[PDB]
Amino acid sequence: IWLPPLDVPPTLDELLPPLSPSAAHGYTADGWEWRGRLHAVVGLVDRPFDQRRDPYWLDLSGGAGHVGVAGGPQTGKSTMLRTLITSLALLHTPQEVQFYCLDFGGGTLAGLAELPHVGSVATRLDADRIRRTVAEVSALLEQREQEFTERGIDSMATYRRLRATGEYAGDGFGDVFLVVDNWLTLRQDYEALEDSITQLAARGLGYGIHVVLSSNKWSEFRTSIRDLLGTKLELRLGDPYESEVDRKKAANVPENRPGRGLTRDGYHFLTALPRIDGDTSAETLTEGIATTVKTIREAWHGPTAPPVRMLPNVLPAAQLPSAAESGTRIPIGIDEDSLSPVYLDFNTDPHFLVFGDTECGKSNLLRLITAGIIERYTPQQARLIFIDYSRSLLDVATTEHQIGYAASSTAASSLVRDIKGAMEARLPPPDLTPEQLRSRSWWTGAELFLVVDDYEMVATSDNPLRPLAELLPQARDIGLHLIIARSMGGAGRALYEPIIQRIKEMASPGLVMSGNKDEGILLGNVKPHKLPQGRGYFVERRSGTRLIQTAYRES
């Protein structure tokens, strides 16, 4: 009934036509009527009462677009992933298929990184790349959901037919595959990426976005996404009681012969090796691949797979939107979610607060915002006052807006006194129409921006800024603005001191940078951890918490 156990696995060249260098389709089956129709051979299969094994093929155009792979330790999960990718790469061009890998299973997908079809591979370490890789594809899905509707794209097949012309630019992509090696490792260390990838699998198959997910056990997949995996390839399972084909058929699956697995129909299949040389051995696997990847890379002289756009180490402030296009809104950086600008609006929320450790970019951020205010406000519209003990804001305090600079504890007290008196005069009288309160009619003048750097050392026992605490929640009516930066040193117990207490109470915008988790939560829901220079969690209780990268101002 079943064929006797094979002793050597097949290779991709065995299960494919004579391969040739094409101009320009890369090293593929030149002219084949089955090339580029999103079918892929992944090994040999033994159907009952067959006397010769047939080539195992998978159709990835349509409902079976998502692929799931299961199996116990060392059962051949990671090799199946590499075979599927290589097989697709042999029958397609980099402009037709793209791969983005999250390798949590032995980190062996790195060998396929130099494939022109692959644009990103992320190890367990590269959290920044991991978190961004998913967000990149998630943004492409949303992009196509509007691109297809604005144009005459009814189905994904139509889109491929247009790019088949060679006269259609499209969105720059083809069929995109999101590959994960250990789904358990993901949902454990990246809980947010579990639900997001799941949402990709839900409605993304009709837009050319595929998910290829691997894991030790089927139960490690939530029902929400496990059912979305149309094509399921099940290898030798520990605890076969949770098999998706048959329990008793899974218990008789050969152990210690990796590659052996079952289909949903119960057929016996064997995973082929990702080689095109002909060597059926597996102890020569690291080197088979290299030659193959090299051959695919050499034969292709066109565009490669689009890379995952990372958050820059240093973000030039010249990139952020000018005052002519942003208005009174002040861009301070871009977010990790979509690489879109992140604005500040002092007409919506008066104050702003920064937390950060040594040399994380606090003083640089204050110089940015101040320069942004200068660029957007005439000195008759907004005046500036600096409390700068460490003299770090010299570059932006030479403007005509500046009508106060305190570099000493004494100079601070002399200013706040004139400040408290000047602002108390703007306090709204008891009897006022709501329209008078809305337009701020009873007083005419400029807005007052109080910029404080290193609040940690101005907040002694006799904090000179404390006399302003009682009128801080009245800022919207008097036109007061406090922009404050502080270190992480004792920042936790600094949330109860008169000023920061009331600033945080007003749900004021702010971000936390490179702090120690010993300090506990400061703003919103984020517990601080070591971040790169300029990076911080932008907390805003309108748009929740977002990881952003702030800009760098020269000199």
Binding site: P379, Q380, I403, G421, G445, A446
Partner: peptide, 7 residues
Amino acid sequence: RVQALLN
């Protein structure tokens, strides 16, 4: 007038 008050 804030502009005249502090200086």
